[PDB]
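Q&A FORM
Asked by: J.P.
Topic: structure of Protein recA

PROVIDED:
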Amino acid sequence: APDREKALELAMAQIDKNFGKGSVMRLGEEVRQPISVIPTGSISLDVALGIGGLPRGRVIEIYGPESSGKTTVALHAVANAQAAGGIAAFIDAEHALDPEYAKKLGVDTDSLLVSQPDTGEQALEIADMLVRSGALDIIVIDSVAALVPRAEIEGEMGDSHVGLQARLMSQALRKMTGALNNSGTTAIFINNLRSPETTTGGKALKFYASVRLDVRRIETLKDGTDAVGNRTRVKVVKNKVSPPFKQAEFDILYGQGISREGSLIDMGVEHGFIRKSGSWFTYEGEQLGQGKENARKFLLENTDVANEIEKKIKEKLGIGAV
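REPLIED BY: S.T.
REPLY: Here is the structure written out as tokens.
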């Protein structure tokens, strides 16, 4: 009577229906559920997600050490959502945001909503109120660690030494998520790994997020013998709308955001559109230059190339079909 694949597909189906799509899936699976997404500003990270970017109406945690690029991604995500005529809101509690860099990544600052809360409670509550207005495409909370409870921001004591901040974020996500789904607003929580969890309240975030990114800094782009930028690496540790555990890498130059040409050169190579013999890069017989940089330059300048590549690369994988 037993046919494992028959008995298995049935199980899996019941599981997905009991808890949602993505409750369980084969890793080698190829999701054909083109959810609505927000381009991460990183082609590789957009493929790594399996859907083309951050899914909408979802909680997204972007954790990592300081300076790893978490914010840059976040900002790009906002820019892209704005271009699709979406409205964005930034719950600030670090007071770090630089709007100039913001615009450079293509963000329309003047039209951005910014709030700088008085307490963790407030910050989340202000965020929730905005969310259920269903007018937001995306909303970014700058620091999860900064959502310190009002009982601690105040002179409160060495007595009620509780786990307060943690449940402060648990009850907050418990009610915000639902709204977020109706609203279709993507919530990106920026988590700075520097309290006993990923930054105190990221203990629930681990369970409430449909997607979790592990941003990390891995290299320092040099070109010759000097500073040009840093290569970041992201790992999709959690993905409830596509097979998780995928990885992506991209360059972010000083004062610049995620380098397009960089991505192009990277993804072109592995995908054999751009042949990279040792040192020297070449595209369709054309001389790109030796050293990832000269290639980035070459591309940055010969915009007609690098556009056919983007094309070629965009085709092979897929950008908008269904």
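FOLLOW-UP: The domain at 259-318 is CATH 3.30.250.10 (Rec A Protein; domain 2).
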